[PDB]
Design an enzyme around this catalytic site. Structure first.
Site, short mmCIF file in Angstrom:
data_model
loop_
_atom_site.label_atom_id
_atom_site.label_comp_id
_atom_site.label_asym_id
_atom_site.label_seq_id
_atom_site.Cartn_x
_atom_site.Cartn_y
_atom_site.Cartn_z
N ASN A 185 0.82 -1.23 0.00
CA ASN A 185 0.00 0.00 0.00
C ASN A 185 0.85 1.28 0.00
O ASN A 185 0.31 2.36 0.24
CB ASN A 185 -0.94 0.04 1.21
CG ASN A 185 -1.52 -1.29 1.62
OD1 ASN A 185 -1.39 -1.70 2.78
ND2 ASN A 185 -2.15 -1.99 0.68
N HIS A 187 3.18 2.29 2.11
CA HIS A 187 3.43 2.88 3.42
C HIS A 187 4.74 2.29 3.98
O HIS A 187 4.94 1.08 3.86
CB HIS A 187 2.27 2.59 4.40
CG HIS A 187 0.96 3.16 3.96
ND1 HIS A 187 0.77 4.53 3.84
CD2 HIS A 187 -0.20 2.53 3.65
CE1 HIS A 187 -0.48 4.68 3.43
NE2 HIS A 187 -1.11 3.51 3.31
N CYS A 222 6.22 7.79 8.99
CA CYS A 222 7.17 8.43 8.09
C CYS A 222 6.67 8.22 6.64
O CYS A 222 6.17 7.15 6.29
CB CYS A 222 8.57 7.83 8.29
SG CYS A 222 9.81 8.36 7.08
#
Ligand SMILES: Cc1ccc(O)c(C(=O)O)c1
Ligand SMILES: Cc1ccc(O)c(C(=O)O)c1
Lengths: 263, 264
Positions: A185, A187, A222
């Site tokens: 995804n 991330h 982050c």
């Protein structure tokens, strides 16, 4: 991998790979962290998921708040490691996933881990208490009696991590995630934070000590285009206090502690 | 994993893991590169190695000079991938390790790879020709008749890669290896170079295209305390690129390559 006889936990065996071992010919804590993630994904898939039907409709996801790992002996390249995982409910605070790492031959325990997960809206990155109609869908996959990987009354996983004061004793600046550091995804996955935390441990400690305990408190995610600074200070076996923050503004994304033993 | 019936090649099955897949829910080329390394290490161990007894005595090691990978279909998370590897002699130039990636169910070929290795003194980093004493020790593990993963009359693995002229169309500056990017001997893993090369491919190409071919020419080893710059230029349905990895400061070349992408 497979569900146990009672369907209340999952077991999986992994054979340690050549590129998964470190300087001392044993598995790295980042490889172990990946194996815990993998056994957790297969457990979630064996029960039918890792979100529930109603929490999919509400744009709700599970996010890690805390990770605690304790390793007594790291498996060597070629060794077989059996890992057992299970979920549990923590009322309206969230969920807890626990893990036990064992030796396939001797049957001994070579490590254990615990993690706290919180529920948030995928879009607004908010945070909310676990609703009752959501608990009824996943509690049928958790043991009813409490099963703690770190049982002991006041042990090590539930201690408050303080914020590292400046100047830090050690630092590693300009850390950026690459495309392999992102998940399906896009991330930045929670294993990269462990690697980033350890990037500021002095090389002399790496060559004379072995990592035994690591507690990480996740405060902010982050991004792909973000730059991180890794800070560390000896607080003492050697102990450290760590802090990950955005290179520019200095906004905190993670804080933790590590404990190292003499080889 | 196990040696085939004739002991002249090795087969191993891998089940694709959750953290090993990318944006397309299929395995990444860096995960594939790790699986080729892993199957190669188990083949070297199943025959008794990947240095010989003469190579260990003379402080000689095997180093990669070129890597060529071609992927027709990337395995999905949960899919089983069977890989078959073998090494062959290239006279006194070096060795060649080849790989065939297959689907466990359908039995079809979903990819293949080829690599050229050179001999080098581990201390002085000086390359040297393959002596006959060393050649006699490992040739008993290679098939005698040539077995090429890319046989074809004029394959794309043996093409000369040019040097990228400045200014590059795309770049990715300040790339450093972390402790997970180093191997058991603390040397930057050959898989990290592939990741570093792809860091300069535009995000638009990633979202509209899939990586089919990748050729990499290894010129120098990057050190733990080194900083790398990744440069890319479109050289072209199919998109082609020329890549260059060089040291951030002086601009000393460490790698050069080409990638070919096809429309999703
Ligand atoms: C501190 C640290 C971080 C990552 C690693 O891979 C190692 C190691 O291989 O011993 C050590
Ligand atoms: C260009 C590129 C580089 C590294 C990667 O892992 C991927 C991906 O995950 O899709 C793509």
């Amino acid at each position: 991998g497979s569900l146990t006889e009672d369907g209340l936990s999952y077991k999986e065996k992994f054979v340690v790979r050549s590129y998964e071992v470190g300087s001392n010919k044993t598995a790295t804590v980042e490889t172990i962290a990946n194996l815990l993630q993998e056994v957790g994904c297969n457990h979630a898939q064996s029960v039918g998921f890792a979100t529930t039907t109603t929490m999919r409709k509400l744009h709700l996801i599970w996010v890690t708040a805390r990770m605690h790992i304790e390793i007594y002996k790291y498996p060597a390249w070629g060794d077989v490691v059996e890992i057992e995982t299970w979920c549990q409910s923590e009322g309206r605070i969230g969920t807890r996933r626990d893990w036990i790492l064992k030796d396939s031959v001797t049957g001994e325990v070579t490590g254990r881990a615990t993690s706290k997960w919180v529920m948030m809206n995928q879009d607004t990155r908010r945070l909310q208490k676990v609703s009752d109609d959501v608990r009824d869908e996943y509690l049928v996959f958790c043991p009813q009696e409490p099963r703690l990987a770190f049982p002991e009354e006041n042990n090590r996983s539930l201690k408050k991590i303080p914020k590292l004061e400046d100047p830090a004793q050690y630092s590693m600046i300009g850390l950026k995630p690459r495309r392999a550091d992102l998940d399906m995804n896009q991330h930045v996955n929670n294993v990269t934070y462990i690697g980033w935390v350890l990037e500021s441990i002095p090389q002399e400690i790496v060559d004379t000590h072995e990592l035994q305990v690591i507690t990480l408190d996740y405060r902010r995610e982050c991004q792909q285009d973000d730059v991180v600074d890794s800070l560390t200070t000896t607080t003492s076996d050697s102990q450290f206090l760590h802090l990950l923050r955005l290179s520019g503004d200095g906004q905190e994304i993670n804080r933790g502690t590590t404990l190292w033993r003499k080889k």
